[PDB]
Amino acid sequence: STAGKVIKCKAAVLWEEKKPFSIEEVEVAPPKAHEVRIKMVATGICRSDDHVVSGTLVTPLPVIAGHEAAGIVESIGEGVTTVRPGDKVIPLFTPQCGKCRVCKHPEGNFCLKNDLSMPRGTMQDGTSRFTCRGKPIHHFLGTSTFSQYTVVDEISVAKIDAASPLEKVCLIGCGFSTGYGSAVKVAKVTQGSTCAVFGLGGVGLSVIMGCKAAGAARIIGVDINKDKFAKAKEVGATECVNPQDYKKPIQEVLTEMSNGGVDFSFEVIGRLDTMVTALSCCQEAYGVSVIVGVPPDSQNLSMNPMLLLSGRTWKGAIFGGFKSKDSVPKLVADFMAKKFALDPLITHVLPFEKINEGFDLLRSGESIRTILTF
Amino acid sequence: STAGKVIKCKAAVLWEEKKPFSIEEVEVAPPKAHEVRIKMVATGICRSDDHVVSGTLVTPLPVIAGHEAAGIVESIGEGVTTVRPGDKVIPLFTPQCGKCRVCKHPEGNFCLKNDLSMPRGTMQDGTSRFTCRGKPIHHFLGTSTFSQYTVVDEISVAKIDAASPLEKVCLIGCGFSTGYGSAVKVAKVTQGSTCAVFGLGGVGLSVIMGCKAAGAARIIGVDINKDKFAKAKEVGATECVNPQDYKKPIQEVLTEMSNGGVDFSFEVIGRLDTMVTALSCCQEAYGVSVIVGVPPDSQNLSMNPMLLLSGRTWKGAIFGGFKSKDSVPKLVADFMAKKFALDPLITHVLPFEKINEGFDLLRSGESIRTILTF
Ligand SMILES: NC(=O)c1ccc[n+]([C@@H]2O[C@H](COP(=O)([O-])OP(=O)([O-])OC[C@H]3O[C@@H](n4cnc5c(N)[nH+]cnc54)[C@H](O)[C@@H]3O)[C@@H](O)[C@H]2O)c1
Ligand SMILES: NC(=O)c1ccc[n+]([C@@H]2O[C@H](COP(=O)([O-])OP(=O)([O-])OC[C@H]3O[C@@H](n4cnc5c(N)[nH+]cnc54)[C@H](O)[C@@H]3O)[C@@H](O)[C@H]2O)c1
Ligand SMILES: [Zn+2]
Ligand SMILES: [Zn+2]
Ligand SMILES: [Zn+2]
Ligand SMILES: [Zn+2]
């Protein structure tokens, strides 16, 4: 039995940037008040986890990364009311405290308790529940899912359907929800519209799914890797373009293709240049462009504000605009009710011990989502 | 007595950047098919007219500037159906052709026939109706209201109430409608919200009017000229701040004043740095910032896209988002019914012949709107 006790378990520790993960034994403290200890069942490899490795996304090291996951509650701390031992859960990398001005706002979801703006790499109380070789190890986004067990604050966990297939619904913890919500909630794609999606990875494919669900007439996928095009068409892209195939800048190409600019564009890569291209290719008077890709640390883009003065709208969002704790259980229920598909995103399923191989598949261009199973 | 004839009249010709206007005789050709010749009654001095002088807003020279005005139709060309001789009219610097994709779109107002995005300084047929000293003179935004007579395309004029006071309602041709619409239509300011308005000239005061009409609880005016504060409070500012008074950057000040960022911010100046400051000061998860000011020609701003990724919305608009020909007559009718006030904007009245004094008043910081009478 493990409740109230330190657990020794396997985790993937990142000791420094640009190194493989180290799979080794960690100690996981029991949960304090308003904390939840979770036995991991499956976790996805999101490009944002690779950003921690590459130093694109700065967070304190050493760290247990991983934020797209699902598992089963092993134990609860004093005062927890929202989950119980044995419940299936999804950790929430964007918390929902329910008390801050953002949580109380009808359209806000970036709760002020997040650890993304100004990452500390701790629990809410400023301390870590992880040690490895006698050293404290940082948390990541209040989740840290590259471990057989994690501890999360109550505001960073949602209870989901007991009959949930966790090897699929772990994608509702980041990539599916982000892309789908970016289309249906943040952009509010309209029926009959023309959309352009920059980046056809797991998140970009989820954007396509949402644009098709919203009734877009045309969905143009844009990627420099033409191997991504077949799956993009399977999930709703009406045509795909590779910028490398053209002499002109792709914003000019997309403007021409859409007879004067697209209704909605999405940046789902994480490059400054594609953020500006995606804004430019939306119609100058009424177009909307949404930034989804995480930009490189501390780098500014350059743009001409006449792109906005003519009437464009530019916005971004975390986690598809979804209020996390309210939304994740409903998304799982909707998945169970066959409202959307997750299998198109899953290209590889590996044991957790093969995490590095899973990252190598992402980096080589050869996977969409690898799901790691504990 | 002048239908079909060239009219010789006085106009304010700008021969050179950074020089006074020259009040001198021009020849005004009669209207061609689908053109309208207007006897001007009143015209306002908008900062954008000054931008032509300063080279902030590039348009071909020599030019007859002026775009905020009202007059009486002197004659109509073949095929004109929407105005008649003797009608009161407001020239529309943003046309409404009614046929392009923007005009057909429910939100769009920046008609594709505009002469603002890539100014040519002509009529829609690519020619000029003005001669001065035997030389062709450019038009400005299809309006050219600094002339006793102008000729406009039919899509650039609206018929207004016959009982209209033209010396007031000329402001509906630019500054009032732009500011008011930026608040009520583009930003969609909500009841009980906190707004920040950067720049307290005629347009920024009109933004304040719109924020107060929408029910904002707090309206923070921001200007480096504290002489602008008294009028801003008269039209609805709850408080005014001068960035020069503070050690910290004003985005930090406004974030602290609003307990974490404002709901809606407006850039109503035309500076790259205040466009980024105005974005930053709106709440990071759900704030909206609207660019109204005209930026210096061909210059790019630099910004961190994390400001958008957290959830901010950034947009701009021309003419307050109003579809011009539909909206201008309705705005005039609402003015006549006392639904808004224009007198607070009018600080000086001069004859047209004193146009250069009117520009001096704007440049010194003394005036809001000077109205020139023909
Ligand atoms: N906003 C959020 O909440 C959120 C959530 C999840 C992911 N992200 C970010 O979203 C981005 C995509 O994540 P993912 O789908 O897991 O990544 P991914 O699977 O690496 O997909 C990125 C795609 O972009 C393509 N690409 C790379 N460079 C270019 C280019 N120059 N032009 C066109 N295509 C290009 C690339 O070939 C690949 O198919 C990353 O930056 C993530 O960090 C953000
Ligand atoms: N988008 C449109 O359709 C549209 C329409 C009309 C005007 N404009 C532009 O809107 C802007 C305002 O026009 P206006 O009200 O006639 O001009 P204005 O009367 O010159 O007002 C501008 C105000 O900005 C203040 N100001 C200058 N620098 C700063 C600073 N650094 N910080 C804070 N305040 C500062 C200044 O003191 C003045 O009161 C100009 O750039 C116009 O070209 C745009
Ligand atoms: Zn919160
Ligand atoms: Zn992610
Ligand atoms: Zn049009
Ligand atoms: Zn103007």
CSV table of N, CA, C and O in Angstrom, one decimal, chain A residues 101-102 105 107-112 114 116-117 258-263 272 275 283-286 291-296 298-306 308-318, chain B residues 101-102 105 107-112 114 116-117 258-263 272 275 283-286 291-295 297-306 308-318:
chain,number,residue,atom,x,y,z
A,101,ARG,N,-9.6,36.5,-11.4
A,101,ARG,CA,-10.4,37.3,-12.4
A,101,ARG,C,-10.5,36.6,-13.7
A,101,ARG,O,-11.5,36.8,-14.4
A,102,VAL,N,-9.5,35.8,-14.1
A,102,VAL,CA,-9.5,35.1,-15.4
A,102,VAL,C,-10.6,34.0,-15.3
A,102,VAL,O,-11.4,33.8,-16.2
A,105,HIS,N,-14.0,35.2,-15.6
A,105,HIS,CA,-14.4,35.9,-16.9
A,105,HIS,C,-15.0,34.9,-17.8
A,105,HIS,O,-14.5,33.8,-18.0
A,107,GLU,N,-14.8,34.5,-21.0
A,107,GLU,CA,-13.9,34.1,-22.1
A,107,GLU,C,-12.4,33.9,-21.7
A,107,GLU,O,-11.5,33.6,-22.6
A,108,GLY,N,-12.1,34.0,-20.4
A,108,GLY,CA,-10.7,33.7,-20.0
A,108,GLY,C,-10.5,32.3,-19.7
A,108,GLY,O,-11.4,31.7,-19.1
A,109,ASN,N,-9.3,31.8,-20.0
A,109,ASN,CA,-9.0,30.5,-19.5
A,109,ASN,C,-7.5,30.4,-18.9
A,109,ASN,O,-7.2,29.4,-18.3
A,110,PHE,N,-6.7,31.4,-19.1
A,110,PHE,CA,-5.3,31.4,-18.7
A,110,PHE,C,-5.2,31.8,-17.2
A,110,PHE,O,-4.8,32.9,-16.9
A,111,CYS,N,-5.6,30.9,-16.4
A,111,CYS,CA,-5.8,31.1,-14.9
A,111,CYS,C,-4.5,31.7,-14.4
A,111,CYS,O,-3.4,31.2,-14.8
A,112,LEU,N,-4.6,32.6,-13.5
A,112,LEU,CA,-3.4,33.3,-12.9
A,112,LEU,C,-2.6,32.4,-12.1
A,112,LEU,O,-1.4,32.8,-11.8
A,114,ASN,N,-1.3,29.7,-13.3
A,114,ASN,CA,-0.4,28.9,-14.2
A,114,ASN,C,1.0,29.1,-13.9
A,114,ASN,O,1.4,30.1,-13.3
A,116,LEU,N,3.2,28.8,-16.6
A,116,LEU,CA,3.7,29.0,-18.0
A,116,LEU,C,4.3,30.4,-18.2
A,116,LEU,O,5.4,30.5,-18.8
A,117,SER,N,3.7,31.5,-17.7
A,117,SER,CA,4.1,32.8,-18.0
A,117,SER,C,5.6,33.0,-17.5
A,117,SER,O,6.5,33.5,-18.3
A,258,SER,N,-7.1,32.2,-52.3
A,258,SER,CA,-8.4,32.6,-51.6
A,258,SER,C,-9.0,33.8,-52.2
A,258,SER,O,-10.0,34.3,-51.6
A,259,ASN,N,-8.6,34.2,-53.4
A,259,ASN,CA,-9.2,35.4,-54.1
A,259,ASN,C,-9.3,36.6,-53.2
A,259,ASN,O,-10.3,37.3,-53.1
A,260,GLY,N,-8.2,36.8,-52.5
A,260,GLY,CA,-8.0,38.1,-51.7
A,260,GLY,C,-7.7,37.9,-50.2
A,260,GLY,O,-7.7,38.9,-49.5
A,261,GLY,N,-7.4,36.7,-49.8
A,261,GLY,CA,-7.1,36.4,-48.4
A,261,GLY,C,-8.1,35.4,-47.7
A,261,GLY,O,-9.3,35.4,-48.1
A,262,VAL,N,-7.6,34.7,-46.8
A,262,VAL,CA,-8.4,33.7,-46.1
A,262,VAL,C,-9.3,34.3,-45.0
A,262,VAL,O,-9.0,35.4,-44.4
A,263,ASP,N,-10.3,33.6,-44.6
A,263,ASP,CA,-11.1,34.1,-43.4
A,263,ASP,C,-10.4,33.9,-42.1
A,263,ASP,O,-10.5,34.7,-41.2
A,272,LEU,N,8.5,32.9,-35.6
A,272,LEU,CA,8.2,34.3,-35.8
A,272,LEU,C,7.7,34.6,-37.2
A,272,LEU,O,6.8,35.3,-37.4
A,275,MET,N,4.3,33.3,-38.0
A,275,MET,CA,3.3,34.1,-37.3
A,275,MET,C,2.9,35.3,-38.2
A,275,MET,O,1.7,35.6,-38.3
A,283,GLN,N,-7.6,37.8,-44.9
A,283,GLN,CA,-8.2,39.0,-45.6
A,283,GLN,C,-8.0,40.3,-44.7
A,283,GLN,O,-8.3,40.3,-43.5
A,284,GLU,N,-7.5,41.3,-45.4
A,284,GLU,CA,-7.1,42.5,-44.7
A,284,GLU,C,-8.1,43.2,-43.9
A,284,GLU,O,-7.8,44.0,-42.9
A,285,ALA,N,-9.4,43.1,-44.3
A,285,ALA,CA,-10.5,43.9,-43.7
A,285,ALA,C,-11.2,43.1,-42.6
A,285,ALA,O,-11.8,43.7,-41.7
A,286,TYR,N,-11.3,41.8,-42.7
A,286,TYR,CA,-12.1,41.0,-41.8
A,286,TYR,C,-11.5,39.7,-41.4
A,286,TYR,O,-12.1,38.9,-40.7
A,291,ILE,N,-2.5,32.6,-33.2
A,291,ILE,CA,-1.2,32.0,-32.9
A,291,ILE,C,-1.4,30.9,-31.9
A,291,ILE,O,-2.0,31.2,-30.8
A,292,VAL,N,-1.0,29.8,-32.3
A,292,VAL,CA,-1.0,28.6,-31.4
A,292,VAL,C,0.4,28.1,-31.1
A,292,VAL,O,0.6,27.6,-29.9
A,293,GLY,N,1.3,28.2,-32.0
A,293,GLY,CA,2.7,27.8,-31.8
A,293,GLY,C,3.4,28.6,-30.7
A,293,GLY,O,3.3,29.8,-30.7
A,294,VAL,N,4.1,27.9,-29.8
A,294,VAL,CA,5.0,28.5,-28.7
A,294,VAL,C,6.2,29.1,-29.3
A,294,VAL,O,7.0,28.5,-30.0
A,295,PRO,N,6.4,30.5,-29.2
A,295,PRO,CA,7.5,31.1,-29.8
A,295,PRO,C,8.8,30.8,-29.1
A,295,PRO,O,8.8,30.5,-27.9
A,296,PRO,N,10.0,31.1,-29.7
A,296,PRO,CA,11.3,30.9,-29.1
A,296,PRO,C,11.5,31.9,-28.0
A,296,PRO,O,11.1,33.1,-28.1
A,298,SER,N,12.2,34.7,-25.6
A,298,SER,CA,12.6,36.1,-25.5
A,298,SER,C,12.8,36.8,-26.9
A,298,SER,O,13.5,37.8,-26.9
A,299,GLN,N,12.3,36.2,-28.0
A,299,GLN,CA,12.5,36.7,-29.3
A,299,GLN,C,11.2,37.5,-29.7
A,299,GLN,O,10.1,37.0,-29.5
A,300,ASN,N,11.5,38.6,-30.3
A,300,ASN,CA,10.4,39.5,-30.8
A,300,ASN,C,10.2,39.4,-32.3
A,300,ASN,O,11.3,39.2,-33.0
A,301,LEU,N,9.0,39.5,-32.8
A,301,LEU,CA,8.7,39.5,-34.2
A,301,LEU,C,8.7,41.0,-34.6
A,301,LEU,O,8.5,41.9,-33.8
A,302,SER,N,8.8,41.2,-35.9
A,302,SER,CA,8.7,42.5,-36.6
A,302,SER,C,7.4,42.5,-37.5
A,302,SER,O,7.3,41.5,-38.3
A,303,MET,N,6.6,43.5,-37.4
A,303,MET,CA,5.4,43.5,-38.4
A,303,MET,C,5.0,44.9,-38.6
A,303,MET,O,5.3,45.8,-37.8
A,304,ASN,N,4.3,45.1,-39.7
A,304,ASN,CA,3.8,46.4,-40.1
A,304,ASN,C,2.4,46.6,-39.5
A,304,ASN,O,1.5,45.8,-39.9
A,305,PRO,N,2.1,47.5,-38.6
A,305,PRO,CA,0.8,47.6,-38.0
A,305,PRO,C,-0.4,48.0,-39.0
A,305,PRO,O,-1.5,47.8,-38.7
A,306,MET,N,-0.1,48.4,-40.2
A,306,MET,CA,-1.1,48.5,-41.3
A,306,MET,C,-1.8,47.2,-41.5
A,306,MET,O,-2.9,47.2,-41.9
A,308,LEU,N,-3.0,45.4,-39.2
A,308,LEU,CA,-4.1,45.4,-38.3
A,308,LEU,C,-5.0,46.6,-38.6
A,308,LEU,O,-6.3,46.4,-38.5
A,309,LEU,N,-4.5,47.8,-38.9
A,309,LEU,CA,-5.3,49.0,-39.1
A,309,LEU,C,-6.4,48.7,-40.2
A,309,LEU,O,-7.5,49.3,-40.0
A,310,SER,N,-6.1,47.9,-41.2
A,310,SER,CA,-7.1,47.7,-42.2
A,310,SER,C,-8.3,46.9,-41.7
A,310,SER,O,-9.4,46.9,-42.3
A,311,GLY,N,-8.2,46.1,-40.6
A,311,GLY,CA,-9.3,45.4,-40.0
A,311,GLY,C,-9.0,44.1,-39.5
A,311,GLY,O,-9.9,43.4,-38.9
A,312,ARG,N,-7.8,43.5,-39.7
A,312,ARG,CA,-7.5,42.2,-39.2
A,312,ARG,C,-7.6,42.1,-37.7
A,312,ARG,O,-7.3,43.1,-37.0
A,313,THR,N,-7.9,40.9,-37.2
A,313,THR,CA,-7.8,40.5,-35.8
A,313,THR,C,-6.7,39.5,-35.6
A,313,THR,O,-6.7,38.5,-36.4
A,314,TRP,N,-5.9,39.7,-34.6
A,314,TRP,CA,-4.8,38.8,-34.3
A,314,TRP,C,-4.9,38.4,-32.9
A,314,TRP,O,-5.1,39.3,-32.0
A,315,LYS,N,-4.9,37.1,-32.6
A,315,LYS,CA,-5.0,36.7,-31.2
A,315,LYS,C,-4.2,35.4,-31.1
A,315,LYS,O,-3.8,34.8,-32.0
A,316,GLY,N,-4.0,35.0,-29.8
A,316,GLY,CA,-3.4,33.7,-29.5
A,316,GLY,C,-4.2,33.1,-28.4
A,316,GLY,O,-5.1,33.7,-27.8
A,317,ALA,N,-3.8,31.9,-28.0
A,317,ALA,CA,-4.4,31.2,-26.9
A,317,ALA,C,-3.6,30.1,-26.5
A,317,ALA,O,-2.9,29.4,-27.2
A,318,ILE,N,-3.8,29.7,-25.2
A,318,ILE,CA,-3.3,28.5,-24.5
A,318,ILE,C,-4.5,27.5,-24.4
A,318,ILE,O,-5.6,27.9,-24.0
B,101,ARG,N,-16.0,41.8,-51.9
B,101,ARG,CA,-16.2,40.8,-50.9
B,101,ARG,C,-16.2,41.5,-49.5
B,101,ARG,O,-16.9,41.0,-48.6
B,102,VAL,N,-15.5,42.6,-49.3
B,102,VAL,CA,-15.6,43.3,-48.0
B,102,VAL,C,-16.9,44.0,-47.8
B,102,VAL,O,-17.5,43.8,-46.8
B,105,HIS,N,-19.4,41.5,-46.8
B,105,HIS,CA,-19.2,40.7,-45.5
B,105,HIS,C,-19.9,41.5,-44.4
B,105,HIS,O,-19.8,42.7,-44.3
B,107,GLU,N,-19.1,42.1,-41.3
B,107,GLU,CA,-18.2,42.8,-40.4
B,107,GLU,C,-17.5,43.9,-41.2
B,107,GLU,O,-17.4,45.0,-40.7
B,108,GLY,N,-17.0,43.5,-42.4
B,108,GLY,CA,-16.1,44.3,-43.2
B,108,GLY,C,-16.5,45.7,-43.5
B,108,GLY,O,-17.6,45.9,-43.9
B,109,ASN,N,-15.6,46.6,-43.5
B,109,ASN,CA,-15.9,48.0,-43.9
B,109,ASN,C,-14.8,48.6,-44.9
B,109,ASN,O,-15.1,49.6,-45.5
B,110,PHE,N,-13.6,48.0,-44.9
B,110,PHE,CA,-12.5,48.6,-45.7
B,110,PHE,C,-12.6,48.2,-47.1
B,110,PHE,O,-11.9,47.3,-47.6
B,111,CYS,N,-13.6,48.8,-47.8
B,111,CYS,CA,-14.0,48.5,-49.2
B,111,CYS,C,-12.7,48.4,-50.1
B,111,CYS,O,-11.8,49.3,-50.0
B,112,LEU,N,-12.7,47.5,-51.0
B,112,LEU,CA,-11.5,47.3,-51.8
B,112,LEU,C,-11.2,48.4,-52.8
B,112,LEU,O,-10.1,48.5,-53.4
B,114,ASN,N,-10.9,51.5,-51.8
B,114,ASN,CA,-10.3,52.5,-51.1
B,114,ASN,C,-9.0,52.9,-51.7
B,114,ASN,O,-8.3,52.2,-52.4
B,116,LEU,N,-6.5,54.2,-49.6
B,116,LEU,CA,-5.7,54.4,-48.4
B,116,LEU,C,-4.6,53.3,-48.4
B,116,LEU,O,-3.4,53.7,-48.0
B,117,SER,N,-4.8,52.1,-48.8
B,117,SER,CA,-3.7,51.1,-48.6
B,117,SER,C,-2.6,51.3,-49.5
B,117,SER,O,-1.4,51.1,-49.1
B,258,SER,N,-5.5,48.9,-12.8
B,258,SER,CA,-6.6,48.0,-13.2
B,258,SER,C,-6.6,46.6,-12.5
B,258,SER,O,-7.3,45.8,-12.9
B,259,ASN,N,-5.7,46.5,-11.5
B,259,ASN,CA,-5.6,45.3,-10.7
B,259,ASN,C,-5.4,44.1,-11.7
B,259,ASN,O,-6.0,43.0,-11.5
B,260,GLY,N,-4.5,44.2,-12.7
B,260,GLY,CA,-4.1,43.1,-13.5
B,260,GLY,C,-4.3,43.3,-15.0
B,260,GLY,O,-4.0,42.4,-15.7
B,261,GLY,N,-4.6,44.5,-15.4
B,261,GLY,CA,-4.8,44.8,-16.9
B,261,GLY,C,-6.2,45.3,-17.2
B,261,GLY,O,-7.1,44.9,-16.5
B,262,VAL,N,-6.3,46.1,-18.2
B,262,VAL,CA,-7.6,46.6,-18.6
B,262,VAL,C,-8.4,45.7,-19.5
B,262,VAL,O,-7.8,44.8,-20.2
B,263,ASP,N,-9.7,45.8,-19.6
B,263,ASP,CA,-10.5,45.0,-20.5
B,263,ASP,C,-10.3,45.5,-22.0
B,263,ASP,O,-10.2,44.6,-22.8
B,272,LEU,N,4.5,53.6,-32.9
B,272,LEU,CA,4.8,52.2,-32.8
B,272,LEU,C,4.9,51.8,-31.3
B,272,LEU,O,4.3,50.8,-30.9
B,275,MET,N,1.5,51.6,-29.6
B,275,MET,CA,0.7,50.5,-30.0
B,275,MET,C,1.1,49.3,-29.2
B,275,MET,O,0.2,48.5,-28.8
B,283,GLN,N,-5.5,43.1,-20.2
B,283,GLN,CA,-5.4,41.9,-19.4
B,283,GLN,C,-4.9,40.7,-20.3
B,283,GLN,O,-5.4,40.5,-21.4
B,284,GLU,N,-3.9,40.0,-19.9
B,284,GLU,CA,-3.2,39.0,-20.8
B,284,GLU,C,-4.0,37.9,-21.3
B,284,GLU,O,-3.6,37.3,-22.4
B,285,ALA,N,-5.1,37.5,-20.6
B,285,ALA,CA,-5.9,36.4,-21.0
B,285,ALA,C,-7.1,36.7,-21.8
B,285,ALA,O,-7.6,35.9,-22.6
B,286,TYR,N,-7.7,37.9,-21.6
B,286,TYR,CA,-9.0,38.2,-22.2
B,286,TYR,C,-9.0,39.7,-22.7
B,286,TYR,O,-10.1,40.1,-23.2
B,291,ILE,N,-6.0,49.3,-32.4
B,291,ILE,CA,-5.2,50.3,-33.0
B,291,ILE,C,-6.0,51.2,-33.9
B,291,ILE,O,-6.7,50.7,-34.8
B,292,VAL,N,-6.0,52.5,-33.6
B,292,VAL,CA,-6.7,53.5,-34.4
B,292,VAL,C,-5.7,54.5,-35.0
B,292,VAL,O,-6.0,55.0,-36.1
B,293,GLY,N,-4.6,54.8,-34.4
B,293,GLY,CA,-3.7,55.8,-34.9
B,293,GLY,C,-3.0,55.3,-36.2
B,293,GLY,O,-2.8,54.1,-36.4
B,294,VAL,N,-2.7,56.2,-37.1
B,294,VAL,CA,-2.1,55.9,-38.4
B,294,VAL,C,-0.6,55.9,-38.1
B,294,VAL,O,0.0,56.8,-37.6
B,295,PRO,N,0.1,54.7,-38.4
B,295,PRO,CA,1.5,54.6,-38.1
B,295,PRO,C,2.4,55.3,-39.2
B,295,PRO,O,1.9,55.5,-40.3
B,297,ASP,N,4.9,55.9,-42.2
B,297,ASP,CA,4.9,55.1,-43.4
B,297,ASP,C,6.0,54.1,-43.4
B,297,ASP,O,7.2,54.4,-43.1
B,298,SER,N,5.6,52.9,-43.7
B,298,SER,CA,6.5,51.7,-44.0
B,298,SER,C,7.3,51.3,-42.8
B,298,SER,O,8.3,50.6,-43.0
B,299,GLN,N,7.0,51.7,-41.6
B,299,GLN,CA,7.8,51.3,-40.4
B,299,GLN,C,7.1,50.1,-39.6
B,299,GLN,O,5.9,50.1,-39.5
B,300,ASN,N,8.0,49.2,-39.2
B,300,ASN,CA,7.5,48.0,-38.5
B,300,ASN,C,7.7,48.2,-37.0
B,300,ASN,O,8.8,48.8,-36.7
B,301,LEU,N,6.8,47.7,-36.3
B,301,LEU,CA,7.0,47.6,-34.8
B,301,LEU,C,7.6,46.2,-34.5
B,301,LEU,O,7.6,45.3,-35.3
B,302,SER,N,8.1,46.1,-33.3
B,302,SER,CA,8.7,44.9,-32.7
B,302,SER,C,7.9,44.5,-31.5
B,302,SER,O,7.6,45.4,-30.6
B,303,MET,N,7.5,43.3,-31.4
B,303,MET,CA,6.7,42.8,-30.2
B,303,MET,C,7.0,41.4,-29.9
B,303,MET,O,7.4,40.6,-30.8
B,304,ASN,N,6.7,41.0,-28.7
B,304,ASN,CA,6.8,39.6,-28.2
B,304,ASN,C,5.5,38.9,-28.4
B,304,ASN,O,4.5,39.3,-27.7
B,305,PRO,N,5.4,37.8,-29.3
B,305,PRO,CA,4.1,37.2,-29.5
B,305,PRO,C,3.5,36.5,-28.3
B,305,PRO,O,2.4,36.1,-28.3
B,306,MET,N,4.3,36.3,-27.2
B,306,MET,CA,3.7,35.8,-25.9
B,306,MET,C,2.6,36.7,-25.4
B,306,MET,O,1.7,36.2,-24.7
B,308,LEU,N,0.2,37.8,-27.2
B,308,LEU,CA,-1.0,37.2,-27.8
B,308,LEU,C,-1.3,35.8,-27.4
B,308,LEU,O,-2.4,35.5,-27.2
B,309,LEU,N,-0.2,35.0,-27.2
B,309,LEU,CA,-0.4,33.6,-26.9
B,309,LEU,C,-1.2,33.4,-25.6
B,309,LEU,O,-2.0,32.4,-25.5
B,310,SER,N,-1.0,34.3,-24.6
B,310,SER,CA,-1.8,34.2,-23.4
B,310,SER,C,-3.3,34.4,-23.5
B,310,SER,O,-4.0,34.0,-22.7
B,311,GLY,N,-3.7,35.1,-24.6
B,311,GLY,CA,-5.1,35.2,-24.9
B,311,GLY,C,-5.5,36.6,-25.3
B,311,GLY,O,-6.7,36.8,-25.7
B,312,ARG,N,-4.7,37.6,-25.4
B,312,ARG,CA,-5.0,38.9,-25.9
B,312,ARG,C,-5.5,38.9,-27.3
B,312,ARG,O,-5.1,38.0,-28.1
B,313,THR,N,-6.4,39.8,-27.6
B,313,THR,CA,-6.8,40.1,-29.0
B,313,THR,C,-6.3,41.5,-29.4
B,313,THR,O,-6.5,42.4,-28.7
B,314,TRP,N,-5.7,41.6,-30.6
B,314,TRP,CA,-5.2,42.8,-31.1
B,314,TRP,C,-5.9,43.0,-32.5
B,314,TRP,O,-5.9,42.1,-33.3
B,315,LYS,N,-6.4,44.2,-32.7
B,315,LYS,CA,-7.1,44.5,-34.0
B,315,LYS,C,-6.9,45.9,-34.3
B,315,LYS,O,-6.5,46.7,-33.4
B,316,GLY,N,-7.2,46.3,-35.5
B,316,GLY,CA,-7.3,47.7,-35.9
B,316,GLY,C,-8.5,47.9,-36.7
B,316,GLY,O,-9.2,47.0,-37.1
B,317,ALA,N,-8.7,49.2,-37.1
B,317,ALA,CA,-9.8,49.5,-38.0
B,317,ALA,C,-9.7,50.9,-38.6
B,317,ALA,O,-9.1,51.8,-38.0
B,318,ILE,N,-10.3,51.0,-39.7
B,318,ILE,CA,-10.5,52.3,-40.4
B,318,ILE,C,-11.9,52.7,-40.2
B,318,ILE,O,-12.8,51.9,-40.3
